[PDB]
Design a protein around this ligand. Structure first.
Ligand SMILES: COc1cccc(-c2cccc([C@@]3(c4ccncc4)N=C(N)N4CC(F)(F)CN=C43)c2)c1F
Length: 372
């Protein structure tokens, strides 16, 4: 169960989520599980659903222990509800270990499961503070670390497949240096953005605006989501750089597709976006540079296949900045829980062209606090 055998253990897309194979119960029941850095429950479909290929059958597991406790999760987009228990869990292409972990058996849901996503549950990798029903429900990663000799770190290489390396950093997954940003508070993986540039032009906003009311790293969100003020400025700058072509407002609202004849996408008309992240030392930062190949999400559809069609994968948020899968796809992302920091390095799998490459670079000096 070495890091070598963990390489390429993920499947999926930014639009429907990346997933890892896991087993629950004794004898083991195989399930595909969404890798979610934006939540903290290990929750699995445990009853039939039209979108589910398979589900967790607790009656077949002798190791299952009922916690006699309900869990009701209504959220802005939909809902999931079920009941708590613990059982034996393993990751076949992860560490060579079996742990006893909390499991939320999902018995009812609304707009949670996705048709054709190929996953049956979610692995919430964030901290206990945001676990449901409350912070006393120990998340999976915490149990994994407590019960084994697995180091308190994991890394994700999302390839627009991919890899989740548990307990370490695999040098074959990235090039150049790893740059670290502090985890501001252990709840979501909260970070601080200190500057935003669009085609080298500073948005010139007070840096607190970029983190209103928090900024997080979330593999379970598709888009780069920005606070209203930031979002409007970003769209204004992107529209200006790309003014040689005019797209419908629906496109900019991330609702409507933009299509070009297959192979003709005019990547060069779209600017680079640089997010400057707080460094590990005062008033020092590094930047992660996103290309349009990251922020223009292809929508695979046989019916539109004479063309290449895309959704604008930047959208407005009322709950802070969300550095989603489209952002993570350019990079190798190290969730260094042990040192309370997140590392970024150029991914060996990011999509680019002969003119531009996604980058992770620094240091940058700014001679105020950027957090809320
Ligand atoms: C890119 O990854 C994804 C793409 C499409 C859907 C999901 C997905 C599906 C169900 C639930 C979630 C969930 C979620 C997980 C657990 N409980 C509720 C929601 N995971 C995350 N990170 N978010 C962000 C949100 F804005 F909150 C909306 N919902 C979520 C994500 C996904 F992770």
């Amino acid at each position: 169960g070495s890091f070598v055998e963990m390489v390429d253990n993920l499947r999926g897309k930014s639009g429907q989520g990346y997933y890892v194979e896991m087993t629950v119960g004794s004898p083991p029941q195989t399930l595909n599980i969404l890798v979610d850095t934006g939540s903290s429950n290990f929750a699995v479909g445990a009853a039939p659903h039209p979108f589910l290929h398979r589900y967790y059958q607790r009656q077949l597991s002798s190791t299952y222990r009922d916690l006699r406790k309900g869990v009701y999760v209504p959220y802005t987009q939909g809902k999931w509800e079920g009941e708590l228990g613990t059982d034996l869990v393993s990751i076949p292409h992860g560490p060579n270990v079996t742990v006893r972990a909390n499991i939320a058996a999902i018995t009812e849901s609304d707009k949670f499961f996705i048709n054709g996503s190929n996953w049956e549950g979610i692995l919430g990798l964030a901290y206990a503070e945001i676990a449901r029903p409350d912070d006393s429900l120990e998340p999976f990663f915490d149990s994994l670390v407590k019960q084994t000799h697995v180091p308190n770190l994991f890394s994700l290489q999302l390839c627009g497949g991919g890899s989740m390396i548990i307990g370490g950093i695999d040098h074959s997954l990235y090039t150049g240096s790893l740059w670290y940003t502090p985890i501001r508070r252990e709840w979501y993986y909260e970070v601080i953005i200190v500057r935003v540039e669009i085609n080298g032009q500073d948005l010139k906003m007070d840096c607190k605006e970029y983190n209103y009311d928090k900024s997080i790293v979330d593999s379970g969100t598709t888009n780069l989501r920005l606070p209203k003020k930031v979002f409007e400025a970003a769209v204004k700058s992107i529209k200006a750089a790309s003014s040689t072509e005019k797209f419908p407002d629906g496109f900019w609202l991330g609702e409507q597709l933009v299509c070009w004849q297959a192979g003709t996408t005019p990547w060069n008309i779209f600017p680079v976006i640089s997010l400057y992240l707080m460094g590990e030392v005062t008033n020092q930062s590094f930047r992660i540079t996103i290309l349009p190949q990251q922020y223009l999400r292809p929508v695979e559809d046989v019916a539109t296949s004479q063309d290449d069609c895309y959704k604008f994968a930047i959208s407005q948020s009322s709950t802070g900045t969300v550095m989603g899968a489209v952002i993570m796809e350019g990079f190798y992302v190290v969730f260094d829980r042990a040192r309370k920091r997140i590392g970024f390095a150029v991914s060996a799998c990011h999509v680019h062209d002969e003119f531009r490459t996604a980058a992770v670079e620094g240091p940058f000096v700014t001679l105020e606090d950027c957090g809320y």
